[PDB]
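User: what does the whole thing look like in 3D?
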Amino acid sequence: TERIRNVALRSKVCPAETASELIKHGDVVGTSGFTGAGYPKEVPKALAQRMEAAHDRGEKYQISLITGASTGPQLDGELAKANGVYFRSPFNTDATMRNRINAGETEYFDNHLGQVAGRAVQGNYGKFNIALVEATAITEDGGIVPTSSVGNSQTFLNLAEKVIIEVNEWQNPMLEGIHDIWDGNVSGVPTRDIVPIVRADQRVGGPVLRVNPDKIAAIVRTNDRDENAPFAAPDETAKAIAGYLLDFFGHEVKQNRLPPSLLPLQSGVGNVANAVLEGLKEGPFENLVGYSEVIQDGMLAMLDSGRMRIASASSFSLSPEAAEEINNRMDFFRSKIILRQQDVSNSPGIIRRLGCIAMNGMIEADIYGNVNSTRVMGSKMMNGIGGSGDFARSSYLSIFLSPSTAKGGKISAIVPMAAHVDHIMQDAQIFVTEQGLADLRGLSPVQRAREIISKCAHPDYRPMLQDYFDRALKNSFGKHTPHLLTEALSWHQRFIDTGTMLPSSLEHHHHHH
Amino acid sequence: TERIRNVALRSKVCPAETASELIKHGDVVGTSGFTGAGYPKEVPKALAQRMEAAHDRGEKYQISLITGASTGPQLDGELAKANGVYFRSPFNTDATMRNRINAGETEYFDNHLGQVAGRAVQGNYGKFNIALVEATAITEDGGIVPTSSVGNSQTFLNLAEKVIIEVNEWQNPMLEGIHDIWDGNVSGVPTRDIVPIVRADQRVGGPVLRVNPDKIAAIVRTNDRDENAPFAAPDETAKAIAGYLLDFFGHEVKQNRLPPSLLPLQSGVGNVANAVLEGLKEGPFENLVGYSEVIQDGMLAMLDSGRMRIASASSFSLSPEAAEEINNRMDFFRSKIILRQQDVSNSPGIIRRLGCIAMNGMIEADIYGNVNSTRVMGSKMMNGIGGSGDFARSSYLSIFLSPSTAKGGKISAIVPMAAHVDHIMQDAQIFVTEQGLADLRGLSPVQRAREIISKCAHPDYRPMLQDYFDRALKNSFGKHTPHLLTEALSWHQRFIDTGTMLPS
Ligand SMILES: *SCCNC(=O)CCNC(=O)[C@H](O)C(C)(C)COP(=O)(O)OP(=O)(O)OC[C@H]1O[C@@H](n2cnc3c(N)ncnc32)[C@H](O)[C@@H]1OP(=O)(O)O
Ligand SMILES: CC(C)(COP(=O)(O)OP(=O)(O)OC[C@H]1O[C@@H](n2cnc3c(N)ncnc32)[C@H](O)[C@@H]1OP(=O)(O)O)[C@@H](O)C(=O)NCCC(=O)NCCS
Ligand SMILES: [Cl-]
Ligand SMILES: [Cl-]
Ligand SMILES: [Cl-]
Ligand SMILES: [Cl-]
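Assistant: Here's the predicted 3D structure for the full assembly of 1017 residues, as structure tokens:
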């Protein structure tokens, strides 16, 4: 079946290489793409080759790359390999791009995901020269049907001088209808519109991205896969974390602080999130709802079982097996899933109104429960803040979950002071590790420390943490949030110097005595 | 005229001492009070005296005190003196209470102001035993007319098992009508209601707090004053800051990035705010609108002159001169001011919708533009985060303003690393000091550092900051946000050790 149903636009079809020539050195390029889903693939590959060829001749060729969130090897990977990106925002997971960022070869700012569209419209990234968007189909009236994510695509189409569409036949035609794109003012010039979502299953718009066809400079027919990461099977650490969390939810329900259907759930991807979703599938709940950034494998499983009634997201984040499952049953799943613009999925007004429960990962937390989501040792970017701030701050309950240690036990995920802060104490109420769960509601910082140290810290690090806290309480400049500035960041420096946060018995350490 | 207009409720009038006896050891007490305005006065004094007596007899007697925001000497002050508060939230400016907090004698958590009502309803502070609320009047239908703030009073009235009202004859009867109390679900059980505010001048509710009269256990007739703001004027540092900001607004308008009337303005309180508002009073931006937390002197002057058309807030914080001014022309000013529940004034959904410009003070920022609003050296509480996070993160533009130094030059307000973070880089776009203005929009952290160091840092500290940054770029673990962990907090330690951040 023909994917370009508007006949006039068929005249704009051309090869990926030709389309890539529209993108010039210095251009700001906005693309589709979120959690490895729905990013353009063939044009970036062609662009990267041409970039490398230019560089080899001493000719500069780089772009500014603004996305929904993370992309995949064909986009972030190829362009990073080519050293073709001078500025990148708002979120990346590609390892080559991460290296460019951490070497200072690519300038990076990880904006809150729900704010990116608004900042783009404000002009913070400059003038958009190109929007490069993957599509399932183009409708009779020239509507652009997105693929496996919506992201910021509508905003980029609005802002960009020229538009390139990749029509990807790998993407199931029955994605058409799964998206909800609003023409309302969510991220435009104030005063903005009320975004009138009052339930997670509510549609407010239509199935297509809208763009003036006169801005469409090229359409490329493609056939290539998303980046469907291998399923991260829960290990025992993940299962323990999920057990503590599920026990907590059960207790909240028994105390009438949550309904048996909980509240709309936001979760992440990977080991721990997978364990939580498996637990939710089998737990004493019913009629669950997702209002999140992503649809993951375990969410499909609950939609299938009926445990989850609907799932709202901006994107899919599926394994190859789950992608095949939904591909084979898209008629069923399309009725259970709504994919929204990320400025709507991550709208603080909506998140608060629905009372979402936010469940997010972390690099580390300090004893006072300030959270680092991004910068190892304070300086080395991992992925980016993503929507963790959108959700943590706006949520009814903000929960952070992590193994109590990292790097095979050589790093403590609970530290005297976080080396970088993404989520302040006020934005984190519950911490869960494989050691236990800290409920910090209504606690002062010193009370938070008592709970975090006792419930969440690993036995290998708890005495060290207690020692820091005890001496800080005796010596700190103020006693409201006790610190010893002489050693607050010393465990991080110890890791940098020695490869472990565990102290040597060849020197004096206060907790050894 | 009679302030208790409901005849039946007059039978509940009793002394402050007797009313204080309703409050028991361990109780959670929610009170009126925000920016030194509208907090209960006489019952807390009577309670404090009884607490001291009890402690002397060997009886425990402490409460959890949850407010709108800051109160005054009769409440935070007297209770702190009596060692009568085991937990305090969300915002304090009293020196005695600050000392209890910094000694570890009172537990404190400074929640985001717009979230306090919702957390109270969720149960985070425990069951509310008592709501203690100051009133201008009680209407014939039993409505409680708030005084100089709204704060969290409606939520506390809803939650509390027993209610005590202080009817304060010191408060101007013409305050009646200025408040806008919404009937809907802003901070209750999800799913919450949409608040239909789409303009800052929009009233969506009524003039009174509502409470079941059967929950009123005591009414106390009082006569005592709120706290006033200082009359003190903007010095040259503050005026320079205001000048840079006003020039920036002018350029934004010229580039069509702001309307000629700007956008709804949120302003913190202090010297810098006064200068900014004083600057705006004679500025080129007409038909201004305030959507803020507090009505300060500067706003009154603008409402007076007509440069500002309307101002929304939850509270007043006025100098005695400005208080005299408004109390003489209340009918005029009442038509230009709307006092809202703080969960509405500080609602991120509303703030973002309106596109507020947030202007807030700070203790310090680091070279990457993370901001500390609260904890000196990382550990010693000043006031609290207040609504600075509510507004900074939700705003159309988030602006932080500070002198480039503190303590007579012995502290740099720009440091290698903030000793505590309240506002992450993403939540701060513009920094202004008396040295200049740093526009950080669209910049990576290393690009932010170049702007902050070169535009905002004091000349005494700029080379030291540049030296730190340059060596960090060479030697840092990663180069995305370069740091030297061995010296990141060393300027703070240097201040602790020597009394100055400047080396010998
Ligand atoms: S309604 C939404 C906004 N709410 C808030 O922003 C709440 C938190 N903000 C505040 O409490 C103030 O804005 C702070 C950050 C304290 C700044 O207040 P000012 O604008 O009035 O600035 P001042 O220069 O007058 O400083 C006031 C006191 O703070 C001390 N101080 C400032 N900076 C430092 C540093 N870097 N180090 C140590 N102390 C610092 C000043 O000394 C001053 O203290 P005093 O003892 O009262 O003189
Ligand atoms: C913080 C975050 C990196 C944790 O990832 P995770 O998958 O949950 O858990 P992991 O334990 O596998 O950690 C991932 C990486 O961070 C590293 N890491 C985690 N904690 C660390 C620590 N305390 N110190 C050093 N490295 C750490 C791990 O080693 C791992 O690195 P690797 O890929 O080289 O092996 C991740 O949640 C994230 O990027 N968050 C930001 C975006 C976000 O939260 N969006 C919200 C909605 S999903
Ligand atoms: Cl809204
Ligand atoms: Cl809390
Ligand atoms: Cl709303
Ligand atoms: Cl930005």
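In plain terms: Residues A 441-442; B 111, 119, 124 surround chloride ion (ligand 4) (CB under 6 Å). Chain A touches chain B through 84 residues (CB under 8 Å).
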